């Protein structure tokens, strides 16, 4: 299914929460009245990451706009997935190793193998 | 131009904070790791879109190119969710 990544490698309460977060995301994206000016991550900085690639030429305004949204979702879901491991260790501080553990639960994150070995 | 490769850490950390309960702390190294992960998310997908663009001799990477790359690379859920957002933006 197209939504397999939503809870891949998750069980129990963690599974339900990430699924619910994705439903929240979807409903938000289906919404009208979007302000395409306000983002947690600046459109200019997103575009600069894209342009760091010498193969990239021109970029439609659509592309950073989509990344702004996608990156929010990415940070949030990975942070939530990482938090499971912090709670499993009875810790209130999220550590790098928690992110590493979260990544290993889903092959969607294989692209990060060099970023977080 | 080197610093262009990574999104600002303060913004990333802010999103992380909102993803966690109010009482949670985030380690310095966790913030930095996340900054690197989400920055790679952009570059990884963009590279896929860019090569398809180059192969087709097209000059502009557009919204559809990002969605196409997302599904090609196994981010099908991102592609489907953001297709909604893209069509709304274009109406």
């Amino acid at each position: 299914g197209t939504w397999a990544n939503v809870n891949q490698g998750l069980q129990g309460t963690a599974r339900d929460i990430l699924t619910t977060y994705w439903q929240h995301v979807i409903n938000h994206l289906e919404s009208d009245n979007h302000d395409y000016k306000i983002h947690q991550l600046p459109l200019a900085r997103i575009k600069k990451v894209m342009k760091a690639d010498p193969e990239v030429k021109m970029i439609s305004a659509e592309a950073p706009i989509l990344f702004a949204k996608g990156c929010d979702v990415f940070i949030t879901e990975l942070t939530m997935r990482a938090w499971i491991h912090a709670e499993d260790n009875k810790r209130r501080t999220l550590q790098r190793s928690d992110i590493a553990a979260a990544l290993s639960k889903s092959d969607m994150f294989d692209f990060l193998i060099d970023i977080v070995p | 131009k080197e610093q262009d490769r990574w999104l600002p850490i303060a913004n990333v950390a802010r999103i992380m904070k909102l993803a966690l309960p109010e009482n949670a702390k985030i380690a310095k190294e966790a913030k930095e790791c996340m900054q690197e992960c989400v920055s790679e998310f952009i570059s990884f997908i963009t590279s896929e879109a860019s090569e398809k663009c180059q192969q087709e001799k097209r000059k502009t990477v557009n919204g559809e190119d990002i969605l196409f790359a997302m599904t090609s690379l196994g981010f099908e859920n991102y592609a489907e969710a953001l297709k909604i957002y893209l069509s709304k933006y274009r109406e």
Binding site: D110, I113, D114 | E40, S43, F44, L73
Partner: peptide, 28 residues
């Protein structure tokens, strides 16, 4: 730790990103 096979949809782009990153690191 270091798998031979990774996500089939991602593998080739991972290799291409490694090459691109090496070029960026040469530039410094």
């Amino acid at each position: 730790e270091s798998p031979l096979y990774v996500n089939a949809k991602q593998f080739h782009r991972i290799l291409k990103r490694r090459v691109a990153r090496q070029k960026l690191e040469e530039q410094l």
